[PDB]
């Protein structure tokens, strides 16, 4: 494993896109995701 | 973070790890640092840690715009922001946040961090939409002054809390930090030396039982186990008055280390040393199916005690490693026989061949474990199933006419027994549950057992400031109504009683009736003066030994133990000093 590069903080230039599509789900024992 | 062969990156919160699952499956990577370690995983929420449980907590206000600090595989880590949605599982609401990367990019850290982006869905429909997972917060840490003397303390340590990696050698460390004359007692030699590599880097001496006493100016930690401590006791008015001892696998019921938990509560009365005791399992609890470190799947279901000819596939038809505990060890070949048959390839275990085979069960791939009770103690395996008819023998000291000890069995085992036997997995996470397939229910009742008589006949045999009597633990000497020190032998007996156990290889009972006999240890007459219900067979045959002299007669001991000829290893042994060979 390599260095994360990372840190903890806010960029408030970062791009604001996505959609909050409201989505209907069982889950899955393996993690995964089901549909209706 | 990359594997090659980025699938994932991680972060590194509050000293521990936090990843996803599917992206490193439970295994273990070596930075620069120290090597990693697994602890805790969540296949339901996709969530594992490293090297320590979760630690940040939940945070999602359902309105606020939260964002994710993306990693990509090729160049630079990029940043956006989003107002997520609701994903609306059927227990519960969690956050969805709308968004997709390149493959390998899944534990991107979300705005403290409130989510371990990855887990996600694709609807054929429209695009594809990933799920702000994250766990609940959770815990261990340093422990407190429980080094103040005329103090027992009670450790309840479950498998795995880092009982032997993280917590023994913090103590260890803070006792030297106090200048104190630790002594650490180990059940067995290989959890001793999973001590001393635990300890690396600390001063700890191990001590071995061909030395009655070793002593230095330069104080070290004394690390020695429970049946050296005991005859070190019993060997040498040398022993050294130490101020911490601290006797890991506790619930041991083994006589010697039965007179060790007595005899250092004794030494804790007298305000002389502050004790630790650690056990899953302390004297005080009866829970068969403990809390453990990753989920146990407990099955009920009949098991077989012989070889089968047929209806178990379920046995066989698992595919991961298989631990199986056996009340004996000719019962234990009759499985293990009946299971080579199948293809499976089988590690055998007992008590006089585990420093011979329990090494082969790390090197070694193998698909089944064979076991009698002494995998209870500190005994750690890769596999995934336990198989536990929780049956197993028991010797008893039967008084009804002359005195002898019997096997009973195969007579259920303790609440206790059971909770170790089913300790033996449930602490490293598998995708798959760990299986405790076991059968039938323990006994509460097992205060017939020889080995609380005999760790009293070792107790109070001890040289002890008088002063007091070393009287047995507090929870356990309730367990016999001896009177104390009614075992007492006095100047050459008491040589030949040790003499008897240490270079006899005898038990403790048959050795105090040999001893309290005042026959002296070379004399082997008394193996040949017995009842005719005292000859011994050996498969079905009775017992001709050619003696020291040249003689021949058969094997009859005027005093019976079942110990001495349960085992074709230990008739072995004792037809050896029958012969007065040894």
Known sequence: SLEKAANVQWDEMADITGSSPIIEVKQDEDGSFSIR | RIMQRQVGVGIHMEGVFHTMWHVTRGSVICHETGRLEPSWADVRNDMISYGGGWRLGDKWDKEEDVQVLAIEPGKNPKHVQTKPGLFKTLTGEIGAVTLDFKPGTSGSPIIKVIGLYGNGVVTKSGDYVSAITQAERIDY????????????????????????????????????????????????????????????????????????????????????????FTTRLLSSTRVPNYNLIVMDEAHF?????????????????????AAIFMTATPPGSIDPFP?????????????????????????????????????????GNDIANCLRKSGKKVIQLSRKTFDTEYPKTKLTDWDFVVTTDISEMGANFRAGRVIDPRRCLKPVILTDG????????????????????????????????????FSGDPLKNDEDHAHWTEAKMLLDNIYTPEGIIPTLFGPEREKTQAIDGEFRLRGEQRKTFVELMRRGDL????????????????????????????????????????????????LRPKWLDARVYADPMALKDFKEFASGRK
């Open chain 2, 141 to 228: 840490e340093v422990d407190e002054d429980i080094f103040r003397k005329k103090r027992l303390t009670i450790m309840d340590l479950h498998p795995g809390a880092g009982k032997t990696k993280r917590i023994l050698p913090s103590i260890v460390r803070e006792a030297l930090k106090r200048r104190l004359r630790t002594l650490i007692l180990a059940p067995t030699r290989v959890v001793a030396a999973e001590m001393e590599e635990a300890l690396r880097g600390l001063p700890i001496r191990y001590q071995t039982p061909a030395v009655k006493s070793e002593h230095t100016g330069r104080e070290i930690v004394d690390l020695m186990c429970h049946a050296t």
């Open chain 2, 253 to 273: 019921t083994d006589p010697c280390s039965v007179a060790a938990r007595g005899y250092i509560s004794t030494r804790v009365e007298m305000g002389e040393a």
């Open chain 2, 291 to 331: 809390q453990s470190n990753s989920p146990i799947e407990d099955i009920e279901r009949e098991i077989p005690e012989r070889s089968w000819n047929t209806g178990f596939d379920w046995i066989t038809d698992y595919q991961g490693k298989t631990v199986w505990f056996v009340p004996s060890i000719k019962a």
């Open chain 2, 402 to 437: 002359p005195e002898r000890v019997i096997l009973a069995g195969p007579i259920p085992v303790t609440p206790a027994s059971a909770a170790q036997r089913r300790g033996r997995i449930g602490r490293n996470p598998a995708q798959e549950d760990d299986q405790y397939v």
């Open chain 2, 507 to 554: 038990p403790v009972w048959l050795s105090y009736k040999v001893a309290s006999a005042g026959i002296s240890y070379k004399d082997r007459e008394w193996c040949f003066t017995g009842e005719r219900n005292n000859q011994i067979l050996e498969e079905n045959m009775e017992v001709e030994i050619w003696t020291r002299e040249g003689e021949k007669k058969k």
